[PDB]
Structure 1
């Protein structure tokens, strides 16, 4: 319940970070 929600929150933040770095790299390559 509480702990599972905490784990899902941390996992979603991690996935958000992956998407963030991917989008930055793709932005650089698209600018080129």
Structure 2
């Protein structure tokens, strides 16, 4: 072995990552609301055929 301060660097990832999951959770919001957009875009398709 003969390496230390692997625990210093590994713990850095333990902080960053907690906040890095909040970011990608806004990207889970894209899935909820392309349901809304697509649902309403069936209605907008009835508008365009008029």
TM bucket (normalised to shorter chain) is 0.5 to 0.7
Task: Flag the structure with higher helix content.
Answer: 1
- Show structure 2 runs of 5+ residues with no match: 1-11, 44-50
Q: How many residues align?
A: 29
Superposed structure 1 runs of 4+ greater than 4 Å apart: none
- Show structure 1 runs of 5+ residues with no match: none
Larger radius of gyration: 2
Q: Return the TM-score normalized by structure 2.
A: 0.47
